[PDB]
Amino acid sequence: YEHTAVMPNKVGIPYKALVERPGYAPVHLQIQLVNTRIIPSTNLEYITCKYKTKVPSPVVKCCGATQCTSKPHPDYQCQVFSGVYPFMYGGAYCFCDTENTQMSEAYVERSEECSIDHAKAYKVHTGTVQAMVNITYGSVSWRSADVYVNGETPAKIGDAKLIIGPLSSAWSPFDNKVVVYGHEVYNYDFPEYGTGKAGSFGDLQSRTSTSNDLYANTNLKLQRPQAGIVHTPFTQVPSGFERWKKDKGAPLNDVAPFGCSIALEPLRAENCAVGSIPISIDIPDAAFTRISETPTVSDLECKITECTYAFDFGGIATVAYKSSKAGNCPIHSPSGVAVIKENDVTLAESGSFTFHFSTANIHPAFKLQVCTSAVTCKGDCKPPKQHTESFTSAISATAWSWIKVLVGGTSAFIVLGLIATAVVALVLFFHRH
Amino acid sequence: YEHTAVMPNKVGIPYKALVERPGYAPVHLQIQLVNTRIIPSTNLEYITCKYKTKVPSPVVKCCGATQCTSKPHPDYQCQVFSGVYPFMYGGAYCFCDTENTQMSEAYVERSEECSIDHAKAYKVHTGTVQAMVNITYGSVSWRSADVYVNGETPAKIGDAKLIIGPLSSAWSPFDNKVVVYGHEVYNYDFPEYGTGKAGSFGDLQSRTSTSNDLYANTNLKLQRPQAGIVHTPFTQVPSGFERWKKDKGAPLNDVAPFGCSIALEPLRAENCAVGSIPISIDIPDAAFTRISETPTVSDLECKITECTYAFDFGGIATVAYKSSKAGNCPIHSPSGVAVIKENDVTLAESGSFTFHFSTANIHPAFKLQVCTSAVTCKGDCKPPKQHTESFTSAISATAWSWIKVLVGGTSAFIVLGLIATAVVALVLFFHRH
16 A cells, blocks of 8 residues: 655654545554755866976076977966076086076976875866655654655655655755865856966866876076076966965855755755655555454543653553553654654553643643544643654634734724624614604 | 857858947857757656566476475466366376366466566656857867856856857757657657556566566466466467557657757757857957958948849859058958858958858848948849748838828828818808907
8 A cells, every 4th residue: 555745854853644545444654854965966077286386407508508498388488598607516606708508497286295286277067866764653663764855756664665855945955166275165156267367266277187287387588697607597476376385265065054064975954854755655555454353442531641842752641441442552643843753652441641742832632543533632831841842833822812812802892892883873863864 | 258149059051240340340250059969967767668478387296186286486376276187298198187287377477588678668857968069269160069058157268268058949849758769759658667557568567687577567467288288378469569569659759840850868859949048158369350450441332233032042142442541351241131151251442352252132221241341242133942041021012012001192192181171161250240
């Protein structure tokens, strides 16, 4: 047998519900989410990390000059330098005259943390959602099960042909352009992939680690070697993306609302418990039994001992009753106002016993079912002093329904007499003639 | 210097435009699309292909029976068979009495074409668009360049800092659920991945080739071995997806409108030339020159020799002119009505020469530019008898503008006299008193 439902998103809290059938004894369930897994169809786009800058041997002669070329490197420079006149220790100044020979050829390359550590710049696409649950139904114990959100998924565990949702709600806080270092992760508005951002963030403007395409600019500029010093004075840009690696902010996981978190590899969002889920599950109709063979109900009465409106099922109340014959029988809460600790109990002969429950009410007047026999225990006044309550408006009290009807009736009656007055007068005036 | 524009989607046709500047001599361009590449962010979901069905050794004894188990296979069956009494050639019937021993244990598995050939069932997501062009600008020859649609893309070729679009139009004919065999490809409405479609299309209901998860049903049912024959008579489903492999249809590439095609690996749509593209390109302002140093225009006149409205630039007309001094100078067509074969010509002293052009017009009256000097050559009447034309309404002829003004003026004048009549009469009637 298959029974379906729409359950609200309750990542932590369990969910029982008794399920019955004419001529058949009922059976309960217990569904309880274990995971929520929201996997976008993302991908990385390009990486970035610190650069490096090397210099080849700067040319030199006694006179004349060599020539600067396009030694292929990012931001690479080279320039002749004339009348160099540089000395070497215990030397002869490398000339007899104007040296004129100094190219100061340059080179820019990439750092080595890049291997260990580099940018992780992503485009994040639609992708999927899934989730894990636990079913402890009927006669079944903890059966934790995981499946995708899609309202189609045919999944059978034992006799449970799971069909899930899909969820009413349709969003997770993500973004197409989100980057990450280490455990942390950050929506970078856009990693300016092709566009060399002066190295300000695109310090390593490369598709991959192994993609040796540095469309970045350290703005390397050479200065004239001088002072008889063999060197390549120069300038270039500081590692701007590192400069931001001083200005890193709050990772999104730390900002994710609904007190829920994220998984690294799939960008699985983790249990932002929002929405409702139209689930559909097959049950073993064999697990049913008859309805007439059952120890039957009778002599229905329950005593509302006491509840104080608190989170824990902070209310105890009992029953007083006489049975057809002893045994066991479920006590479902079709109205989960006083959220019952219990869902199924033994029913001994004259089952006259208690139970526990929480409602946010100052007091209810409600009822629920037991052993295919819904009985009424209204719910006394409740003292005040993680988890839910009833809380909608069930906290109703005496004075509320007292004064509301007081004022309504007073106004109604007075205005009714008022309107009566007019025709009451007019009738005999008509009678005059 | 940077100049931008919005060019319409012209996949094949070239595009020149002269670009000028005050105090600066102008320069032309020539843009011409080479590719259009529309890459969705797709993926495959699951595969399907022919099955296979094997049988283990069916049990046998002299009497009694062995037992059928859950030999784990898709659609696997097994059933005892009693009083089998089967013979073997030159044997002794394998019994002395009721055999009772025959399990007919079964097995279903997968075919081997699956390796070579299986389904390719996809979810197709947003993804991107890009395209290739050729620029032959100014003094530049064929420079074919490729880049993504995004209105951001900073791309420099030579001095051309390309920024592209993005395209006005925003769609390609695709679908999330599209499948493919071989070169062909088909929108399968939905490949019922988890749901065993009786093997009707989900004959191999598996995530991957190596995913050995066959959530499919050949509906294998055994028949009783009999007739003293050792065998496993049975039934199961024919390869339904193959049955459709008889009912394959028209691949989408063959149905793709805009006479354009598709690329296999990225689902790159190929040059459905629709829309307009706001491109932005930097030019070498150094490639400019002055404006005063130029051989100057004078003595402007062009002879409209003849054009017949046809596709090819089927119209020739000339100029008659005297120059300040000889040289060269561009002839841009700001009004590309008569689509000029020419865009830039030498300007010898008294440059009095010709050119070619097509317009759909029966006759224009229009003009365009030459050497920073727009001159007028109206466009004679055109005979009638791949590529564009002017074609909007420029095919205007004499009788059209003749009769339109004829009828308009006649109606206007007659109604004007008509309205005049009234007050014309009334005035002297007023005068009477």
